[PDB]
Each structure stands twice: as structure tokens, then as C-alpha cells.
Design an enzyme around this catalytic site. Structure first.
Site, short mmCIF file in Angstrom:
data_model
loop_
_atom_site.label_atom_id
_atom_site.label_comp_id
_atom_site.label_asym_id
_atom_site.label_seq_id
_atom_site.Cartn_x
_atom_site.Cartn_y
_atom_site.Cartn_z
N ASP B 25 0.77 -1.25 0.00
CA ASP B 25 0.00 0.00 0.00
C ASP B 25 0.80 1.30 0.00
O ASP B 25 1.15 1.87 1.01
CB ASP B 25 -0.93 -0.02 1.22
CG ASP B 25 -1.97 1.10 1.22
OD1 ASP B 25 -2.01 1.92 0.28
OD2 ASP B 25 -2.76 1.14 2.17
N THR B 26 0.99 1.83 -1.20
CA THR B 26 1.71 3.13 -1.27
C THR B 26 1.04 4.37 -0.71
O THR B 26 1.63 5.42 -0.52
CB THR B 26 2.07 3.47 -2.71
OG1 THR B 26 0.88 3.57 -3.48
CG2 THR B 26 2.97 2.40 -3.30
N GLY B 27 -0.26 4.24 -0.46
CA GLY B 27 -1.00 5.34 0.16
C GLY B 27 -1.07 5.32 1.70
O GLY B 27 -1.59 6.22 2.34
C1 A78 Z 1 -9.60 5.11 -0.17
C2 A78 Z 1 -10.60 3.95 -0.09
C3 A78 Z 1 -11.52 3.96 -1.33
C4 A78 Z 1 -9.92 2.56 0.15
N1 A78 Z 1 -10.96 1.51 0.26
C5 A78 Z 1 -10.87 0.43 -0.50
O1 A78 Z 1 -10.04 0.34 -1.39
N2 A78 Z 1 -11.74 -0.58 -0.26
C6 A78 Z 1 -12.77 -0.48 0.77
C7 A78 Z 1 -11.57 -1.83 -1.03
C8 A78 Z 1 -11.15 -3.02 -0.20
C9 A78 Z 1 -12.14 -3.80 0.42
C10 A78 Z 1 -11.73 -4.89 1.19
C11 A78 Z 1 -10.36 -5.15 1.32
C12 A78 Z 1 -9.46 -4.32 0.66
N3 A78 Z 1 -9.84 -3.28 -0.09
C13 A78 Z 1 -9.02 2.56 1.39
O2 A78 Z 1 -9.36 3.22 2.35
N4 A78 Z 1 -7.89 1.81 1.36
C14 A78 Z 1 -6.97 1.67 2.51
C15 A78 Z 1 -6.83 0.22 2.91
C16 A78 Z 1 -8.09 -0.32 3.51
C17 A78 Z 1 -9.02 -0.99 2.70
C18 A78 Z 1 -10.21 -1.47 3.27
C19 A78 Z 1 -10.46 -1.29 4.63
C20 A78 Z 1 -9.51 -0.63 5.42
C21 A78 Z 1 -8.33 -0.14 4.87
C22 A78 Z 1 -5.58 2.11 2.16
C23 A78 Z 1 -5.47 3.49 1.57
O3 A78 Z 1 -4.12 3.61 1.15
C24 A78 Z 1 -5.78 4.62 2.56
C25 A78 Z 1 -5.79 6.00 1.87
C26 A78 Z 1 -5.97 7.18 2.80
C27 A78 Z 1 -4.86 7.89 3.27
C28 A78 Z 1 -5.04 8.98 4.13
C29 A78 Z 1 -6.33 9.37 4.53
C30 A78 Z 1 -7.44 8.67 4.06
C31 A78 Z 1 -7.26 7.57 3.20
N5 A78 Z 1 -4.82 4.62 3.67
C32 A78 Z 1 -5.14 4.72 4.96
O4 A78 Z 1 -6.29 4.72 5.36
C33 A78 Z 1 -3.94 4.81 5.91
N6 A78 Z 1 -3.76 6.14 6.51
C34 A78 Z 1 -2.67 6.90 6.43
O5 A78 Z 1 -1.63 6.52 5.92
N7 A78 Z 1 -2.77 8.15 6.95
C35 A78 Z 1 -4.00 8.65 7.59
C36 A78 Z 1 -1.66 9.09 6.84
C37 A78 Z 1 -1.66 9.81 5.51
C38 A78 Z 1 -2.11 11.14 5.43
C39 A78 Z 1 -2.10 11.76 4.18
C40 A78 Z 1 -1.63 11.05 3.07
C41 A78 Z 1 -1.20 9.74 3.27
N8 A78 Z 1 -1.21 9.12 4.46
C42 A78 Z 1 -4.09 3.73 6.99
C43 A78 Z 1 -4.25 2.32 6.37
C44 A78 Z 1 -2.89 3.74 7.95
#
Ligand code: A78
Lengths: 99, 99
Positions: B25-27
Site C-alpha cells: 500500500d503506497t498510500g
Molecule cells: C480510499 C478507499 C476507497 C480505500 N478503500 C478500498 O479500497 N476498499 C474499501 C476496497 C477493499 C475492500 C476490502 C479489502 C481491501 N480493499 C481505502 O481506504 N484503502 C486503505 C486500505 C483499507 C481498505 C479497506 C479497509 C480498510 C483499509 C488504504 C489506503 O491507502 C488509505 C488511503 C488514505 C490515506 C489517508 C487518509 C485517508 C485515506 N490509507 C489509509 O487509510 C492509511 N492512513 C494513512 O496513511 N494516513 C492517515 C496518513 C496519511 C495522510 C495523508 C496522506 C497519506 N497518508 C491507513 C491504512 C494507515
């Protein structure tokens, strides 16, 4: 390009004539942008992640340009902490992970 | 290896002799793993994402192996649906984004 992951992989996108920054996110299935007015009809949708679910507006067939590469696809607009470019558009521009 | 993004980039990791699967996960800035009981000292922490925040336990200096590649670092443990490998460990294995 090749992007290393020492800092966040934020790039500039162009969309609707605006410039934004967005995050290239292999952990997202979909593309989510901050609230904005786009042209076109839209459907109310929900999407989830850490923390739960948000309501978004789905826009289909939207043209977007990511570091000079065109992609045409679905964008979700809604109350996201950051602009997210997901796997639906990363595949269109030939994005892979390498190591 | 080169991983494409047609499907979710799930790979096998080893943690503590246990194999698991995890999303590359690069995000994500952080690594987040499903509930398990590790030995060692933890801090309480909260991480956020799309719909808000969750509570997790922070472990430091954890060794994980990602596709035969070792990485060592901080891991958060909590009620996540999916195991997530974030940039803190991805950088250690030399992982880049290419297009
Ligand atoms: C964006 C959204 C459409 C995405 N959802 C999906 O892709 N889904 C629901 C599909 C799915 C379903 C089942 C299984 C797997 N995938 C998602 O949230 N993906 C996150 C992984 C996840 C999937 C399902 C359930 C829980 C988690 C991973 C994303 O990279 C997500 C993107 C994000 C970043 C910052 C804010 C909001 C969203 N990262 C995160 O949520 C991370 N946070 C994070 O890194 N930060 C809050 C710091 C930050 C701030 C700014 C920029 C980057 N990072 C978590 C995992 C630690």
C-alpha cells in the site's frame, strides 16, 4: 517516472481544468477526490476504509490527466482527507509496483 | 518482481514463522496488521483513514518478511479487515512505482 516511497507519492493531476495534488494509492480500489463541482450527472454512493463509510458522488467517464498521462474513468467526489488516485485509474496509465 | 494493479496487490508475508497475506500500500504511511498477540512492549495509538479513526497497538522493531525480502520496523496492530504494508516497510524492500 520511477517514484520512490521515502516521501508520500503525491503528484499533480489535472481535472475539470483545475490543478490538484493527489496520492498515488495502490491500496485503493477507487478514486476519491475532495469535494468539487464537476460537470455532469452523478450518483450517490458509499465507500469505506479505515474508520468506516463516507458518502460520495459518483462521476462516470471523467477525463483526468496524471503527470501528463490521460485516463478516462470513474471519479468519486466527497469528504476525503486527501485526494486519492486508485487502482481504477493507475492501471490506465500503465502503473506497476516494482522491487 | 513487478506487480501489476489489475487486482489488489496482495502478497505473502512472514511474521514470526507465520505466513500471511498483506496488501502492498503506497498510500499508507504506516503498516497495519490484523489482531494478533505479539510479545513485547506496545504504545496505544490512533490511526485514521477514510471514515475516521481507529485504535491500535504500536509495536516497534518488528521484523517482517515480504516476498523473501526482510524489513524491520514499526507495526500497528488492530481491528483492521486487511493486513496493510505501508511505506515504512516498502521503502526498505526497495519498492518503487513505475509508469
Ligand atoms: C480510499 C478507499 C476507497 C480505500 N478503500 C478500498 O479500497 N476498499 C474499501 C476496497 C477493499 C475492500 C476490502 C479489502 C481491501 N480493499 C481505502 O481506504 N484503502 C486503505 C486500505 C483499507 C481498505 C479497506 C479497509 C480498510 C483499509 C488504504 C489506503 O491507502 C488509505 C488511503 C488514505 C490515506 C489517508 C487518509 C485517508 C485515506 N490509507 C489509509 O487509510 C492509511 N492512513 C494513512 O496513511 N494516513 C492517515 C496518513 C496519511 C495522510 C495523508 C496522506 C497519506 N497518508 C491507513 C491504512 C494507515
Amino acid at each position: 517516472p520511477q517514484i520512490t516511497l521515502w516521501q508520500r507519492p503525491l503528484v499533480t493531476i489535472k481535472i475539470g481544468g483545475q490543478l490538484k495534488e493527489a496520492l498515488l494509492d495502490t491500496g485503493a480500489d477507487d478514486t476519491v477526490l475532495e469535494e468539487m463541482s464537476l460537470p455532469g450527472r452523478w450518483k450517490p454512493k458509499m465507500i469505506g476504509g479505515i474508520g468506516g463509510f463516507i458518502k460520495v458522488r459518483q462521476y462516470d467517464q471523467i477525463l483526468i490527466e496524471i503527470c501528463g498521462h490521460k485516463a478516462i474513468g470513474t471519479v468519486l467526489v466527497g469528504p476525503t482527507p486527501v485526494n486519492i488516485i486508485g487502482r481504477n485509474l493507475l492501471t490506465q496509465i500503465g502503473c506497476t509496483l516494482n522491487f
